[PDB]
Amino acid sequence: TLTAILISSVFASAANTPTPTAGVQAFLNVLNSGGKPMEQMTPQEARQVLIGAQQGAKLPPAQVSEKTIQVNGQAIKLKIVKPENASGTLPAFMFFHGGGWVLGDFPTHERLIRDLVRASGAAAVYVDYTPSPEAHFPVAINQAYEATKWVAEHGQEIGVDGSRLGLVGNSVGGNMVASVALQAKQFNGPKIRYNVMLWPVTDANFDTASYNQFENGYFLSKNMMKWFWDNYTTSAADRNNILASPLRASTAQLKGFPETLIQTAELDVLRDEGEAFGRKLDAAGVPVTVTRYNGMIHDYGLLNPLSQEPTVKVALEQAGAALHEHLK
Amino acid sequence: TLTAILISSVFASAAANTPTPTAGVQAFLNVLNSGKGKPMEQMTPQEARQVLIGAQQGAKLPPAQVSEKTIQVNGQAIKLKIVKPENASGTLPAFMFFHGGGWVLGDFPTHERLIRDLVRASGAAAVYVDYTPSPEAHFPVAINQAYEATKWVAEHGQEIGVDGSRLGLVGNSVGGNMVASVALQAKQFNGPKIRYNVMLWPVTDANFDTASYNQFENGYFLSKNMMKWFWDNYTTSAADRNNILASPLRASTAQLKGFPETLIQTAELDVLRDEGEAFGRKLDAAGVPVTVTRYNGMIHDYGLLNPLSQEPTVKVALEQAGAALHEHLK
């Protein structure tokens, strides 16, 4: 009886090219119809673009606190985010924000951070590193490492088990994850349970296939990336330093890197260098997972206008679930 | 000074995003491709079934509870296997589980480790459906059994300790095809309600000419000739292959409107990769909430094959599928 209907005309019908999802396309359509390119702005002007765009988002419940640490004649501001009904001592992850070294701060990233805390059950420790061009390489990655060391050694002071410590970051913050992990390897600690590199920057080069395919029109442009790198450091030697361009590390330099998750966006100039870095990690014996989220642009999980995109909600839940498993 | 070390030669670099297997997947392929047996499509169904049975046999299973129930629908009996978290007691949401194997291969034991992993990661009960294999049956027997079993759980789930109103659909390969087929029947027949679909490296079209079909046609376990053989055992009818319950990629936007919220996982080095990703794009164009995740370095059935159950990507991918399902079954 059913089989007759199933084979009938009731169910008759009549190239995997990258395209944004409908929700991402709607965001891009307005952006691309707008004005002045970011690389022609001052740092202050560019910072305000992200501040104004992120302002006023609905924040999911979480507990936020603040601590300023003193390390090696340096004050470092931390913002600590915990699940709303947190009790007892929690594992933690450092959180390194994106923004091309020039942009970004805690409020711009707060919704993303809260999403990752909720999905992982772990405390986030945001590091308020000095932006570029006020500082150049390697000021911020040094601050990031020193703050990581402080949490590992003193984390009980903020209710965290510093022995169960991850590193999480988006974009240049994902670069910062790799930079802190490589410092920790060279300096014999602290131990890191897991890295989450969200759509990371991994190389000071602008000629991968994805750089060419998504050069303009996909929110993050090639020229923005060049501007960001120029504000960070114009030194060829710095750009050849694995703490800036971790894609340039050899297999031997990557051996022993922490277990890692890399998320990439299908329509992101940075996609190919993030995926390539994952392949290099695996060749060095590092346990690594690389997930490409189709239809997405760079910073899909950051931009508050995209916070209800189905892929965004799933991707961040999935990053949190992986983190939770590795912080037990 | 600390900066001095960071800018120093200590950190100078000592040292094209081409698809390659991870080291662990390559090790598995080297064992597999070392065998001197004949191609699967030259085997009898029984011989081919034994290949997958043996590949999966003897694996460590993570803790879970397993039970069985045979249901009677429209005069036909359908065997179910029900998998719950080890410490389950209390009503749970559920997902139907449709196994893969090209319609010819597969069963519960071959898929048990995968099913248990998804149950543990999601907290939900799995209801495996023992559909009739091909060529013993052809289209649409198995997808009808799958739909009838789904309807039964929705209406009678209390009998197995499940809230049938919170019901997902999960399957790998042709099982992911079966997810879409059951969802499209449910839309046509006005129920049951489905919270979430998880299509794991699915078959979506009876065509063999996508770029991934050509790039990965041999050497990556699942071959183009295997896929043609599986389809041929399932149905050689052109009309059936043009039916959206067999080739859901051929559905129009209007036919896909209202499909349940969906997660699709694809493997980078899988003939089926492109049709799975293309189906996700079609769902999104029809207003369906859909996430498509490609796992790099993986072959087809990365999450099924027990020799790959300790591959880092596998463990993470299945945890991530379970987390998405948990969020949608609350």
Cα torsion at B217, B221, B222, B228 (round to 10°)? 70
What would the CATH number be for the domain defined by A1-328? 3.40.50.1820
Which chain B residue's Cα is nearest to A73? B2
Residue A6's H or E segment, with its range, is helix A2-6
- What residues of B are in contact with residue A21 (Cβ under 8 Å)? 284
Three-state SS annotation for A135-199: CCCCHHHHHHHHHHHHHHHHHHHHCEEEEEEEEEEECHHHHHHHHHHHHHHHCCCCCCCEEEEEC
- Largest distance between two CA atoms of chain A: 81
Contact criterion met (CB < 8 Å) for B13 and A259:
no
Helix (H) or strand (E) holding A31: helix A22-33
Locate B56 and state its tokens: 């999966």
Asked if the Cβ–Cβ distance from A3 to B144 is below 8 Å, we say: yes
DSSP letter, residue A41: S
Residue partners of B165: CB distance under 8 A and separation at least 6: B154, B157, B193
Q: Angle CA(B236)–CA(B240)–CA(B246) in degrees, nearest 5? A: 105
- The phi, psi pair for B77, rounded to 5°, reads -95, 140
Closest CA to A282 of A290, A272, A293: A290
CA distance A251 to A234: 26
The CA distance from B164 to A235, in Å, is: 62
Retrieve residue A216's tokens: 């303009």
Yes or no: say if B105 and B48 are a contact pair by the CB < 8 Å rule.
yes
Q: Collect all residues of chain A within an 8 Å Cβ-Cβ radius of residue B22.
A: 282
Torsion of CA A126, A254, A328, A67, to 10 degrees: -20
Whole-angstrom CA distances from A209 to A264, A270, A272 are 14, 10, 7
Structure tokens at B87: 């410490």
- The residue annotated as part of the active site, out of A268, A299, A307, A326, is A268
- Give the number of C-alpha atoms closer than 13 A to the C-alpha of residue A292, restricted to the C-beta side: 27
- CB B3: neighbour CB atoms within 10 A? 12
Q: Could you give the 3-state DSSP secondary structure of residue B8?
A: coil
Distance of CA A104 to the CA centre of its chain: 12
Q: How far apart are CA A183 and CA A204, in angstroms?
A: 19
Can you tell me which residue has the tokens 């570029």?
A132
Q: Which of B173, B212, B223, B309 is catalytic?
A: B173
d(CA B301, CA B200): 8
Total number of residues shown for chain B: 330
d(C-alpha A196, C-alpha B206), whole Å: 38
A207 is catalytic: no
Chain-chain contact of A209 with B16 (C-beta, under 8 angstroms): yes
Q: Which residues of chain A have a CB within 8 Å of the CB of B245?
A: 6, 11
Alpha carbon distances (Å) from B174 to A34, A247, B122, B177, B261: 46, 38, 22, 5, 19
In contact, B257 and B287? CB cutoff 8 Å: yes
Chain B residue with Cα closest to A292: B294
Which DSSP helix (H) or strand (E) runs through B71?
Answer: strand B65-73
Contacts of B8 (CB under 8 A, 6+ apart): none
Distance, CA of B99 to CA of B230 (rounded, Å): 14
- Percent helix, strand, coil in chain B, to 5, is 45, 20, 35
Question: What is the separation of C-alpha A5 from the centre of its chain, rounded to a whole number of angstroms?
Answer: 50
Instruction: Decide: B261 and B328 in contact? Cβ < 8 Å.
Output: yes
What span, in angstroms and rounded, lies between the C-alpha atoms of A3 and A229? Answer: 62
> What is the signed CA dihedral for A247, A251, A253, A258, rounded to 10 degrees?
80
User: Distance between CA atoms of B10 and A277, rounded to whole angstroms?
Assistant: 20
Q: The tokens of B206 are what?
A: 């009876």
For chain B, how big is the Rg over CA atoms in Å?
20
Let me know: does A24 contact A31? Beta carbons within 8 Å: no
Joined tokens for residue B177: 């095809």
Alpha-carbon gap, residue A151 to A125, rounded angstroms: 8
Q: B72: burial class by Cβ within 10 Å (0-12, 13-18, 19+)?
A: exposed
| Nearest-by-Cβ selection for A12 from B140, B242, B285 | B242
Token pair 């299509």 is at which residue? B199
Q: Does residue A314 come out as left (phi exceeding 0), alpha (psi in the -120 to 50 range) or beta?
A: alpha
Token couple for B75? 């005069």
Distance, in Å, from the CA atom of A235 to the CA atom of B12, rounded to the nearest integer, reads 13
Hey, CA dihedral for A240, A245, A247, A250, is it positive or negative? positive
Would you state the structure tokens that stand for residue A71, as one six-digit string? 């390390």
CA distance B100 to B301: 9
Token pair listed for A55: 């302002």
Take residue A228 and report the two structure tokens written for it.
Answer: 């960001």
Residue of A315, A284, A303 whose CA lies nearest to A49 = A303
Which phi and psi (to 5°) does residue B167 adopt? -130, 125
Angle (nearest 5°) at CA A150 between A147 and A153? 155
Residues of A in contact with B287 (CB under 8 A): 22
Give the Cα separation of B180 and B170 in Å (integer). 10
d(CA B258, CA B244): 15
> Could B185 and A289 be called an inter-chain contact, meaning their C-beta atoms sit closer than 8 Å?
no
Element (H, E) at A51: helix A43-54
Cβ–Cβ of A295/B292 closer than 8 Å? yes
A13-37 CB burial, b ≥16 within 10 A, e <16: beebebebbebbeebbeeeeeeeee
Tokens 């361009």 belong to residue: A245
Joined tokens for residue B217: 């046609």
Instruction: Please report, as a single letter, which amino acid is at residue B168.
Output: G
For A129, the token pair is 């590193």
A36 CA: distance to closest CA in chain B (Å): 31
Number of helices and strands (H, E) in chain A?
Answer: 12, 8
Query: In B, which residues are within 8 Å of A275 by CB distance?
Result: 17, 296
Contact of B97 with B130, CB cutoff 8 Å: no
Tokens representing A176? Answer: 């910062």
* Rounded Cα–Cα distance for residues B311 and A289 (Å): 9
Residue type for position A218: Y
Nearest by Cα to A163 from A197, A125, A193: A193
Residue A68 burial (C-beta neighbours within 10 Å; 0-12, 13-18, 19+): exposed
Give yes or no for a contact between A290 and A157, defined as CB atoms under 8 angstroms apart.
Answer: no
Contact A160, A123 (CB under 8 A): yes
Q: What pairing do the DSSP bridges indicate for beta strands A123-127 and A75-82? A: antiparallel
- DSSP secondary structure of B250-287: G--HHHHTTPPPEEEEEEEE-TTHHHHHHHHHHHHHTT
Q: What are phi and psi of A260, to 5 degrees?
A: -140, 145
Q: What is the 3-state secondary structure (H, E, C) of A77-144?
A: EEEEEECCCCCCCEEEEEEECCCCCCCCCHHHHHHHHHHHHHHHCCEEEEECCCCCCCCCCCHHHHHH
Chain A nearest-CA residue for B311: A287
Interface test with A, best of B132, B182, B270, B316 (most A CBs within 10 A): B316
B270 as an active site residue: the answer is yes
CB contact under 8 A, B274 and A137: no
Q: Which of A171, A210, A245, A307 is catalytic?
A: A171
Radius of gyration of chain A (CA): 20
Q: What is the DSSP letter of A296?
A: E
Method for this entry = X-ray
Which of A2, A146, A234 to mutate: most B Cβ within 10 Å? Answer: A2
Token pair of A3, please? 């089989």
Retrieve residue A231's tokens: 């504000």
Residue A276 has its nearest CB partner, among B17, B278, B320, at B17
Secondary structure (3-state) at A76: strand
CA distances to A266, A267, B278 from A17, in Å: 10, 10, 8
- Name the residue among A177, A173, A113 with its Cα closest to residue A145: A177
**DSSP single-letter state for residue A221:** -
Asked if residue A251 lies in contact with residue A257, where contact means CB atoms within 8 angstroms, the answer is no
Measure the CA–CA gap between A40 and A55, rounded to whole angstroms.
23
Q: Longest C-alpha distance within chain B, in Å?
A: 81
Half-sphere exposure of A145 (CA within 13 A, CB side): 23
- Chain B residues whose CB is inside 8 A of the A210 CB are 17
Interface touch B296/A278, C-beta < 8 Å: yes
DSSP secondary structure code for residue B87 in this structure: T
Among A3, A240, A245, the residue with its CB nearest the CB of B140 is A3
Which chain B residues are within 8 Å of A310, Cβ to Cβ? Answer: 261, 289-291
| Angle (CA) B207 A310 B312, round 5° | 70
CB under 8 Å to B146, separation ≥6 — which residues?
B96, B98, B129, B131, B178, B181, B182
| B144 contacts A2? CB cut-off 8 A | yes
Give the distance from CA B212 to its chain's centroid: 18
Task: Break chain A into its structural domains and give their ranges.
Answer: 1-328
B74 neighbourhood in chain A, CB within 8 Å: 1-2
Taking CB atoms and an 8 Å limit, are B188 and A11 in contact across chains?
Answer: yes
Pair B192, B167: CB distance under 8 Å: yes
What CA–CA distance (Å, rounded) separates B317 from B315? 6
Instruction: Give the residue carrying structure tokens 């209801």.
Output: B127
**Kind and range of the H or E element at B188?**
helix B174-188
Please confirm, yes or no, whether A203 is among the known catalytic residues.
no
The verdict on a CB contact (< 8 Å) between B313 and A290 is yes
Instruction: Please tell me the distance from the alpha carbon of residue B309 to that of residue A218, in angstroms, as a whole number.
Output: 37
Angle at alpha carbon of residue B118, lines to B113 and B120, rounded to 5°: 95
Both ends of chain B: CA-CA distance in Å? 53
Residues comprising chain A, all counted? 328
Q: Which helix (H) or strand (E) holds A3?
A: helix A2-6
Give the residue from chain B lying closest to A274, CA to CA.
Answer: B17
What pairing do the DSSP bridges indicate for beta strands B65-73 and A288-297? unpaired
CA gap A140, A135 in Å, rounded: 7
Name the 3-class secondary structure at B93: strand
Give the span between the Cα atoms of A55 and A48, in whole angstroms: 10
d(CA B55, CA A136): 54
Which residues are CB-contacts of A252 (< 8 A; sequence separation ≥ 6)? A284, B14
From B6, B280, B289, residue closest to A142, measured CB to CB: B6
Give, as one character, the DSSP assignment of residue A241.
Answer: B
* Class of B1-330 in CATH: alpha beta
Torsion of Cα atoms, B64 then B46 then B268 then B317, to 10°: 0
Q: CA B65 to CA B88: how far, in whole Å?
A: 8
Q: Classify each residue of A236-262 as buried b or exposed e, where b means 16 or more C-beta atoms within 10 Å of its C-beta.
A: eebbebbbbbbbbbeeebbeebbbbbb
Query: Whole-angstrom Cα distance, residue A172 to residue A229?
Result: 10
CA separation for the pair A174, A262 (Å, rounded): 9
DSSP B107-167: -HHHHHHHHHHHHHHH-PEEEEE-PPPTTTS-TTHHHHHHHHHHHHHHHHGGGGTEEEEEE
Tell me the residue type at B229: W
Nearest to A146 by CA among A161, A160, A125: A125
CB contact under 8 A, B239 and A12: yes
